[PDB]
Design a binder for this molecule. Structure first.
Ligand SMILES: *[SH](=O)(O)c1cccc(CNCCCn2c(Sc3cc4c(cc3I)OCO4)nc3c(N)ncnc32)c1
Length: 208
């Protein structure tokens, strides 16, 4: 069963801006997604200090970057806190609305798209390089969900019946046809070294 939802107008506008604005520095999407994973790993780690059973779903805290040229996907996998259905449908949109407003105001004052993470909406930078984004996520006391959007004003959520993850999030970037450089080992390594070199969890770049 697949549920279809409308983005808030402000978030649809942000996604359109990211898709339509001419901006060549697209590589910053990876820093934003790795930062989000690092934050999620920080969160499960700190919560586990007062409730160690929150790691029953997996003790290892890490990030995997998995390119697949057959599928034309780049996947960012973490074993962080994960997201609930309530996050996916309601709560993330609440903070994304205020963050988008501040980001738009900063852009009008001369800021550039690379500062998007300062406004809490860095996830949507995925649409600099992806025509579709699928997010598989599992939070401790909730089901495994698949979120998906090709923009256009809507997203879907369904219960995921794929390989169980234990706990964490996979962001699957279905790359635009002209953005396949982000499947190349040398290019991904270059970007991680430039923008994500002090992340406090192992980042494993898979090879194909
Ligand atoms: S906690 O609950 O005290 C707490 C403290 C501070 C902040 C938060 C809220 N964190 C939300 C993180 C969401 N998120 C992201 S970004 C993101 C992902 C997706 C959408 C929108 C956004 I904005 O729509 C679909 O997916 N990336 C995350 C990862 N990798 N893991 C967990 N949470 C993530 C809570």
């Amino acid at each position: 069963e697949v549920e279809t939802f409308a983005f808030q107008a402000e978030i649809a506008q942000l996604m359109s801006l990211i898709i339509n604005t001419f901006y060549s520095n697209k590589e910053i999407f990876l820093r934003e997604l790795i930062s989000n994973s690092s934050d999620a790993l920080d969160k499960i780690r700190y919560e586990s200090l007062t409730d160690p059973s929150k790691l029953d779903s997996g003790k290892e805290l890490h990030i995997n970057l998995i390119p697949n040229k057959q599928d034309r996907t780049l996947t960012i996998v973490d074993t962080g806190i994960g997201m609930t259905k309530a996050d996916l449908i309601n709560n993330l949109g609440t903070i994304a609305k205020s963050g988008t407003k501040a980001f738009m105001e900063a852009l009008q004052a001369g800021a550039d798209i690379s500062m998007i993470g300062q406004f809490g909406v860095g996830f949507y930078s995925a649409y600099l390089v992806a025509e579709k984004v699928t997010v598989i996520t599992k939070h401790n006391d909730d089901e495994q969900y698949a979120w998906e959007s090709s923009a256009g004003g809507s997203f879907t959520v369904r219960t995921d019946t794929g390989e169980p993850m234990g706990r964490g999030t996979k962001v699957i970037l279905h790359l635009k046809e002209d953005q396949t450089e982000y499947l190349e080992e040398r290019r991904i390594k270059e970007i991680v070294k430039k923008h994500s070199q002090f992340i406090g969890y192992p980042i494993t770049l898979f090879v194909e």
